[PDB]
Design an enzyme around this catalytic site. Sequence first.
Site, short mmCIF file in Angstrom:
data_model
loop_
_atom_site.label_atom_id
_atom_site.label_comp_id
_atom_site.label_asym_id
_atom_site.label_seq_id
_atom_site.Cartn_x
_atom_site.Cartn_y
_atom_site.Cartn_z
N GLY A 1 41.76 -21.27 20.70
CA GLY A 1 43.05 -21.70 20.17
C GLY A 1 42.90 -22.27 18.78
O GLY A 1 42.01 -21.85 18.02
N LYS B 1 31.24 -23.00 19.58
CA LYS B 1 32.46 -23.20 20.38
C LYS B 1 32.25 -23.85 21.76
O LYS B 1 33.24 -24.15 22.43
CB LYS B 1 33.17 -21.85 20.56
CG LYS B 1 33.70 -21.28 19.25
CD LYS B 1 34.32 -19.91 19.46
CE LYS B 1 34.70 -19.26 18.13
NZ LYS B 1 35.45 -18.00 18.33
N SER C 1 41.92 -14.75 22.56
CA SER C 1 42.31 -13.37 22.25
C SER C 1 41.52 -12.33 23.04
O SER C 1 42.09 -11.34 23.51
CB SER C 1 42.17 -13.10 20.75
OG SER C 1 40.84 -13.30 20.32
N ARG D 1 32.79 -16.41 16.20
CA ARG D 1 33.64 -16.05 15.05
C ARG D 1 34.79 -17.04 14.86
O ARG D 1 35.58 -17.26 15.77
CB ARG D 1 34.20 -14.63 15.20
CG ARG D 1 35.17 -14.21 14.10
CD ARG D 1 35.54 -12.74 14.18
NE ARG D 1 34.43 -11.87 13.80
CZ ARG D 1 34.47 -10.53 13.80
NH1 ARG D 1 35.58 -9.88 14.18
NH2 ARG D 1 33.40 -9.84 13.43
N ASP E 1 37.69 -6.79 20.83
CA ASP E 1 38.68 -7.69 20.23
C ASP E 1 38.31 -8.05 18.79
O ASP E 1 37.19 -8.53 18.52
CB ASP E 1 38.81 -8.96 21.08
CG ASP E 1 39.86 -9.91 20.56
OD1 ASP E 1 40.95 -9.46 20.15
OD2 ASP E 1 39.59 -11.13 20.58
N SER F 1 37.41 -11.71 18.00
CA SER F 1 36.09 -12.19 18.42
C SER F 1 34.96 -11.43 17.73
O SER F 1 35.14 -10.28 17.30
CB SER F 1 35.96 -12.04 19.93
OG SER F 1 37.09 -12.61 20.57
N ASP G 1 31.79 -16.60 22.03
CA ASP G 1 31.43 -15.91 20.79
C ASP G 1 31.31 -16.96 19.68
O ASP G 1 31.42 -18.15 19.95
CB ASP G 1 32.45 -14.81 20.45
CG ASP G 1 33.73 -15.37 19.85
OD1 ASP G 1 34.09 -14.96 18.72
OD2 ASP G 1 34.38 -16.23 20.48
N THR H 1 39.18 -15.37 19.94
CA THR H 1 37.95 -16.05 20.46
C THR H 1 37.78 -15.43 21.86
O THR H 1 38.76 -15.05 22.50
CB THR H 1 38.14 -17.54 20.54
OG1 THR H 1 38.05 -18.03 19.21
CG2 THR H 1 37.05 -18.26 21.34
C1 LIG Z 1 39.74 -15.63 18.55
C2 LIG Z 1 39.77 -17.06 17.76
C3 LIG Z 1 39.04 -16.81 16.40
O1 LIG Z 1 41.18 -17.32 17.46
C4 LIG Z 1 39.25 -18.37 18.51
O2 LIG Z 1 40.30 -18.85 19.37
C5 LIG Z 1 38.92 -19.55 17.52
C6 LIG Z 1 38.34 -20.74 18.30
C7 LIG Z 1 37.57 -21.66 17.51
C8 LIG Z 1 37.20 -22.86 18.13
C9 LIG Z 1 36.45 -23.85 17.47
C10 LIG Z 1 36.03 -23.66 16.16
C11 LIG Z 1 36.38 -22.47 15.52
C12 LIG Z 1 37.13 -21.48 16.18
N1 LIG Z 1 40.13 -19.98 16.78
C13 LIG Z 1 40.26 -19.88 15.44
O3 LIG Z 1 39.41 -19.42 14.68
C14 LIG Z 1 41.61 -20.37 14.87
C15 LIG Z 1 42.64 -19.25 15.05
C16 LIG Z 1 43.95 -19.71 14.94
C17 LIG Z 1 44.60 -19.68 13.70
C18 LIG Z 1 45.91 -20.13 13.57
C19 LIG Z 1 46.62 -20.62 14.69
O4 LIG Z 1 47.91 -21.09 14.68
C20 LIG Z 1 48.62 -21.54 15.86
C21 LIG Z 1 45.96 -20.65 15.93
C22 LIG Z 1 44.64 -20.19 16.05
N2 LIG Z 1 41.46 -20.68 13.43
C23 LIG Z 1 41.80 -21.88 12.89
O5 LIG Z 1 42.27 -22.83 13.52
C24 LIG Z 1 41.54 -22.00 11.37
C25 LIG Z 1 40.17 -22.63 11.11
N3 LIG Z 1 42.61 -22.81 10.76
C26 LIG Z 1 43.80 -22.25 10.45
O6 LIG Z 1 44.08 -21.07 10.66
C27 LIG Z 1 44.86 -23.18 9.84
N4 LIG Z 1 45.97 -23.24 10.79
C28 LIG Z 1 47.14 -23.75 10.04
C29 LIG Z 1 48.38 -23.79 10.87
O7 LIG Z 1 48.07 -24.55 12.09
C30 LIG Z 1 46.93 -24.06 12.82
C31 LIG Z 1 45.72 -24.13 11.96
#
Ligand SMILES: *C[C@@](C)(O)[C@](*)(O)[C@H](Cc1ccccc1)NC(=O)[C@H](Cc1ccc(OC)cc1)NC(=O)[C@H](C)NC(=O)CN1CCOCC1
Lengths: 224, 219, 241, 240, 204, 244, 196, 243
Positions: free
Chosen positions: B47, B33, B129, B19, B166, B169, B17, B1
């Site tokens: 996160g 976000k 990220s 994504r 990145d 993102s 962003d 992100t």
């Molecule tokens: C660059 C990115 C995409 O990581 C950015 O930080 C996203 C922020 C965001 C905020 C609000 C809504 C949507 C997105 N984060 C994500 O897309 C996260 C990335 C991520 C995956 C896994 C872990 O583990 C510590 C951390 C960050 N994606 C998610 O949370 C997705 C929807 N769910 C999962 O991957 C399921 N996991 C299972 C294990 O525990 C964490 C959640």
Amino acid sequence: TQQPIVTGTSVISMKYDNGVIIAADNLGSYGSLLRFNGVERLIPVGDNTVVGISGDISDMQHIERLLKDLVTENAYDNPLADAEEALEPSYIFEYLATVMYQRRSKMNPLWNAIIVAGVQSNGDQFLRYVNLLGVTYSSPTLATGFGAHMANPLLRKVVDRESDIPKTTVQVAEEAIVNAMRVLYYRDARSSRNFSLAIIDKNTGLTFKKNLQVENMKWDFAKD
Amino acid sequence: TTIAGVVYKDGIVLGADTRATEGMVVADKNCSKIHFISPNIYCCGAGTAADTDMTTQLISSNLELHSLSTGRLPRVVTANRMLKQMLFRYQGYIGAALVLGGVDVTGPHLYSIYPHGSTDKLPYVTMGSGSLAAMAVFEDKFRPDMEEEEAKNLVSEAIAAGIFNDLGSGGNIDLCVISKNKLDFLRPYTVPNKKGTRLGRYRCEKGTTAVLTEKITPL
Amino acid sequence: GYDRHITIFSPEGRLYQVEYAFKATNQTNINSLAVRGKDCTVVISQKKVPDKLLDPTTVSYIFCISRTIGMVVNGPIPDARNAALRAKAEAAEFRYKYGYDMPCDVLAKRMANLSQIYTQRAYMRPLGVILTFVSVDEELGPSIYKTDPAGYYVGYKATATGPKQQEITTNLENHFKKSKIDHINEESWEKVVEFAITHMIDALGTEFSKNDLEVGVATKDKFFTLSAENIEERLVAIAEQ
Amino acid sequence: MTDRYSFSLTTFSPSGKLGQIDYALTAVKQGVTSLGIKATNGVVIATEKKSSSPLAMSETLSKVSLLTPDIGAVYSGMGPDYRVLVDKSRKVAHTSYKRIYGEYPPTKLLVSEVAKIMQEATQSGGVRPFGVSLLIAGHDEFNGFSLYQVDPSGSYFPWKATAIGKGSVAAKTFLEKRWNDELELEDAIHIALLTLKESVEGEFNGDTIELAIIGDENPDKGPRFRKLTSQEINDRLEAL
Amino acid sequence: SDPSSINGGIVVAMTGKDCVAIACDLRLGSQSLGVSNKFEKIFHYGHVFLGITGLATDVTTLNEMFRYKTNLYKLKEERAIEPETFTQLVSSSLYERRFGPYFVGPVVAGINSKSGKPFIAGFDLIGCIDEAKDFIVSGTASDQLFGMCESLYEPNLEPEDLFETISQALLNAADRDALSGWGAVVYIIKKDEVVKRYLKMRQD
Amino acid sequence: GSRRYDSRTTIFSPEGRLYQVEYALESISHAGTAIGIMASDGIVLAAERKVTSTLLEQDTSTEKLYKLNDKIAVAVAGLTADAEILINTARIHAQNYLKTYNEDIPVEILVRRLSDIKQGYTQHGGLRPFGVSFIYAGYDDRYGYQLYTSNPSGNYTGWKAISVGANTSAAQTLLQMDYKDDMKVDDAIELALKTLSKTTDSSALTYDRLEFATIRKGANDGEVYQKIFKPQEIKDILVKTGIT
Amino acid sequence: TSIMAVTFKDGVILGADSRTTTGAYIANRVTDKLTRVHDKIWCCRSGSAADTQAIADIVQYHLELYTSQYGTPSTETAASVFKELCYENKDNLTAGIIVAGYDDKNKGEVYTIPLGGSVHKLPYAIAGSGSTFIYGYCDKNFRENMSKEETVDFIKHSLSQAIKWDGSSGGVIRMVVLTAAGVERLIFYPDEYEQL
Amino acid sequence: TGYDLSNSVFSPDGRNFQVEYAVKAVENGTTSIGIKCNDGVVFAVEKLITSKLLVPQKNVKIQVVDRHIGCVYSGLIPDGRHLVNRGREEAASFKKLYKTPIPIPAFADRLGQYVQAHTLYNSVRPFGVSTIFGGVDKNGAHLYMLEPSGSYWGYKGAATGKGRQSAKAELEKLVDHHPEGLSAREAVKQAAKIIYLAHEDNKEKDFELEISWCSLSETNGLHKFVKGDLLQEAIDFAQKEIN
Ligand SMILES: *C[C@@](C)(O)[C@](*)(O)[C@H](Cc1ccccc1)NC(=O)[C@H](Cc1ccc(OC)cc1)NC(=O)[C@H](C)NC(=O)CN1CCOCC1
Ligand SMILES: *C[C@@](C)(O)[C@](*)(O)[C@H](Cc1ccccc1)NC(=O)[C@H](Cc1ccc(OC)cc1)NC(=O)[C@H](C)NC(=O)CN1CCOCC1
Ligand SMILES: [Cl-]
Ligand SMILES: [Mg+2]
Ligand SMILES: [Mg+2]
Ligand SMILES: [Mg+2]
Ligand SMILES: [Mg+2]
Ligand SMILES: [Mg+2]
């Protein structure tokens, strides 16, 4: 469960005809770093007891406060607090021994080795050890950590068994302790030159000596 | 992100962003976000996505109740404290990395909040990220007391740096401009990538799939 | 007649224990007054040291709750100190949780809500005190808010509390009817204190020495109480015009 | 300190009366008049700001409270009791509803939650009932505009229009004559000001009256609750 | 060992013009062993549909849990829950087990009865809402479904055009996954009729 | 201490009665009459609202008839607030049973549960009892159509026809006179209204003073349907039966 | 981190670098590691940023409540509250804090609280990763009862070296001067201190 | 009526009669006093010798808190001991957290809040003691007196018990005749006199004098009991003044 961070090294001690002597250097090590050069590790309790502590310094400071608080509490509703009902070495030790064993049994030990040196009401010499495991023992000479390996052999040559205690004077005993402190400074990598010494005598009372130094150091054989 | 924020002359500009990813797959290409905390305070979130959504919502809810009782607009410091103290209590297990920005009675304030409960108070911040790519743009071109359209461009430029450089993102750029006189929630601010055009129609014609049975029920 | 012993309704729809707590309020026989300047809020109170054996420096019904908030109590000292310690605790907790100094009115409402609980729950008695909170709030400016045993609270342009409160209230009411403003139009707090003392003298019909008064002053970013000598300087200026 | 009052302080008397609820209703009777009227395109709630002293700033004391963006409340009876019900009502609208469903509760359910709290003070150990009656006006998408009354017992009823407290018997009769099912919101505000003038002794103006509406959205939505300003009331008092 | 791939299975949902579609496979296994070919993963609470992939005991537990909650909702609210509201209820419920979660991949689908707007949504195991207009996918062949949906899908499809799109997405994705298939169901949902069709697919 | 102020709500009188239960029943005797009549092809619930002004919004009002699940309803007599506490507890027990067994709760089991809760307040806790009497109208596939009542004592019983609240003595005589076992729902509707029409303390019985409901299996494909009557529908059935 | 507190004739001065790191990435280059727990009691923070902030906020609360009831607390009292938190929560914390304050009675005082939770009252103190490199320098150059300008130079030279050798330290050198005259904040930029 | 049957109940006056009844138990007790001097405080108490079988000097009434605070009380002796036990807990927790020994005003409010709490509920009885206490802290000497209601103030001199009026009159003379102040050794002598003069209200049985003191010069700011020669010197001074 923890790990010791700031640490103190050897506490050494012995009995003699009229009382006991105890000594410990003034260093608080931080691993290999000789961090704190002004740490007092002999802590007197009343005018008849000195508690010498090695190991973790934060836990030593905790124990120091427990003893300070013990004196306060013994004074409460006690008209004989400075006479027949004053704190004894045997009372102070048993308390610490109880605490040390309780803490090890909760898996959260006080990371120390303690020697309680003093003289009782009836003139008897008191000298006993306790550590982080609650293990206790008494002997004519007692030493913690490194001193057990180097100080005890020297001090035992003066008092090898119980029957040697009446034959040992305060001068002979003090010389032996100061001699042992020199030997530990040569050979213990976590020791210092500066130390404190305490004599608890049944006649002359508590004498507390600060800012002593190891002297008469043989280094001349190095140049060859 | 890639999330970022700057303090400019009149107030705060926040950026993000769009994504959302699972594994290495993009689940949502236009995911929001930038979260509402109060009418004068917003929060960008990176996160663990669930942790980011629920943590902002809980603190937004509690500030609403706080603000109803006191009768005055909430402050950024209280939003910062409530988020901080909660994240600290949970020792990093609530994986929320926030950029908190708002405008008080005391002026504009910008914070970054970390999962373990540490906060930095700064004139510009980046997280996620894509924080290095975005921070490079701020170290290159930031200056204090910027005008509004300049600050918008800098944040947009910083999010873009994250989008392109990145892999975490991507998608569109969302902004949130906060000043004493207005709140401008720009979604999307920019569409830096067109959606790829497909050259064929692969949809099947009716009756192509093989059915066993059927049932119809009205409502 | 146990509906008079605990906090339950009488047939008339009344809580007699609340009403009797209001009467405990005057047991000290002390009058307090509070007024607002431009930059400040001033609170004055009568000080009575009947015993010569008392250390007069320890005889006080004014309390520094936080750095910005001061509180004067009309009522017995044990209940006054109960209320003081709680308000201090509450103001400290607020700053820790929410990161800014507790406003005067928010503390007033908080203490009022606690007072309300004692009127509804039977095992707790009401405190026999009226609490007057003063500050220079960073959003609302000079502020006076008052709490009582009922759990009522409200903001004031000025106020007065005690046995002779009605006399002080009408004196103040008449002044603001002339000036047609919500405050004392004065730059220095020293002159607002002089006003407060002057209008209490007129209302009560008694002269004061330095040891008969107790003064508290709220400014932006601090509340402080005046010493005997600071009050004496104040009394000299009143006499000289 | 043991809270030894683990037993009910409200009990049935030989006649089947719950004394403390009746007595709480007597306290509500002594309180200042408040009312509510429901129009086709809105609801109005109103009450007198009975100032305890002229030195007091009556703007600080809000008798009419926002509970959610689309729900408002007013009362007659004991103000401190009302204040803690408003606090709990606002909180329960978040904990047991908004944090679950992501939207504010409908008027009837928030009313039901407040009623529950009031009922519990009527049966739990070591407490007296609340000494207030509430009038809750609100809007929600599926039920539309609505107006409810809530009594110390926990009992609640929906109203087209009603009044509570001091002059409620006379005020309800006045409303029965004036109310119809084709009222616009402005017509209901006009009737509310007429009805409230009868029960007020002294000064009758925007500074001594508190009046709010649940109406159109004021610019996700805008809030339908709006508290009328001192000036807005006075304007309508010239066309009275 | 990995709870999300012991039992296996998939769910996909799509929007169309004044309609939504949700579909699932019928397999339940213990890793390699196929056990049941009648284990449906789509449930409904009024007009709101919920698909659930993942650990089968949690699929069943959550179905029973959301039936419970939506029943009490209807009794108190005096109306059926809407997709937008139900989505928030799923998210809340999953997040309240944040540090001991249900090992599931839920998917909401339905038409808002008042506005008439088609609605779909998806969630991770701790309740983060994927709130996409086009399509939502879940299960052991999610990667496969993402690829199928991205190349086949287009907006505003008529109900029977949409049927062909979702069906081909499911079938071809399942046939590239060892733990999916064994039959399939497709619901075509319109504002006041629902067509449920069972698909003929290879039984390996 | 506190003992001084304790009413002691859970004791026997010298005669062996529970004071507070008896006094709660006295409270309920003043509440608006509610009637339940069980026919071979359905159950009727009828109840009289009380006090009522012209300004009461009737179509959004519910003081008497409440829905526990799709198969079971209740008519209330007593404190409405007290009833709603119990109703929400009952609504939960039904859903717990549904979650556990994947079958709708049998009517008697739900009734026993609520009745056991009421009992507990008479034997322990030192709190006042619930000032409520319920008529339960329900269906299950064991016993079919069932009517029950419960009261503040926690005692419950089954009935073919029954009344609670005001003028039950008069109401129960009139029902006992005109009820027959082979009766049908349309006839029971007429009996329920006629009984209220005679026992009412009002001058006349009108649509605005009534709540009314039927539980019929009378639906397409043999399934149970609860019908809570709207204001206009109660007005129609009053004209049909010839009361207005 | 490189931090130090030094007593001198007129009172005490606290000093710190401004670098905050996440591995090799400098997350905040302009960090303020000198935090205020009372009017004239401040602390230097080293260790976990989250832990030291959480502690410093709790101490600030305790001393505000102390002030409400018992007036201005001594520097020793502040150190004891820091110690109590650090010692009792030693298993869950990574905090190395120097406490420095000015009384009128006691003048300048410095207390250091290392990882263990022990307390040590000292004429001056050094701490943080960068402190290792300046033990030699600080021991040789420290004198008691220095002037303000000498103590500012002693801290500036010391932290300049700590920054030069430690990658974990860097940015600006912040200082906070505590005397009877009041509280003065000083800053020194790379272009000034690097050429020393 | 019935307002006096339960603690924490306001009468129609605004009074808590149970507290006022506790005061009667205090008035019933033996005489105890406190004298603030130049650099400290002196405490003294009347100990009635009920019988020849009482061991002299053994049944000690004055109690120490921490190492720097002295407490004496009149009324129900066990209630006083209960309060000092709590005082010791308060002083211990203060020192544990803040390092410094508890200041006297700080300590005074700790007892005050605790005593006041026993007037808030009907499930507890108020304390049947007035407690005179004080000592030396960083800000100098402090003397306090604490009543059953929770009321306390600072004092130049303090007195309670059966002989309180007699004692108060004597204390008022000292305050007038020594505006510049009284020395610690003077205050011990005066304390002895005042207990001997206040013994005329308990004149049936003979008594035993007990004195304690904290003084910055004479005891290093620590609480000590007056014993031996200094006690006998104070008794001789007191015996001379009555004759
Ligand atoms: C660059 C990115 C995409 O990581 C950015 O930080 C996203 C922020 C965001 C905020 C609000 C809504 C949507 C997105 N984060 C994500 O897309 C996260 C990335 C991520 C995956 C896994 C872990 O583990 C510590 C951390 C960050 N994606 C998610 O949370 C997705 C929807 N769910 C999962 O991957 C399921 N996991 C299972 C294990 O525990 C964490 C959640
Ligand atoms: C020399 C230096 C710069 O490290 C000095 O000690 C810093 C003191 C400081 C910084 C900011 C404000 C106040 C005081 N400390 C840091 O910069 C720390 C380094 C550090 C991290 C972790 C631990 O022990 C667990 C000790 C020291 N930096 C941080 O705390 C940063 C903000 N956060 C992280 O590095 C995240 N990590 C993730 C792994 O879990 C621990 C926190
Ligand atoms: Cl509150
Ligand atoms: Mg989102
Ligand atoms: Mg009470
Ligand atoms: Mg397959
Ligand atoms: Mg196969
Ligand atoms: Mg560097």
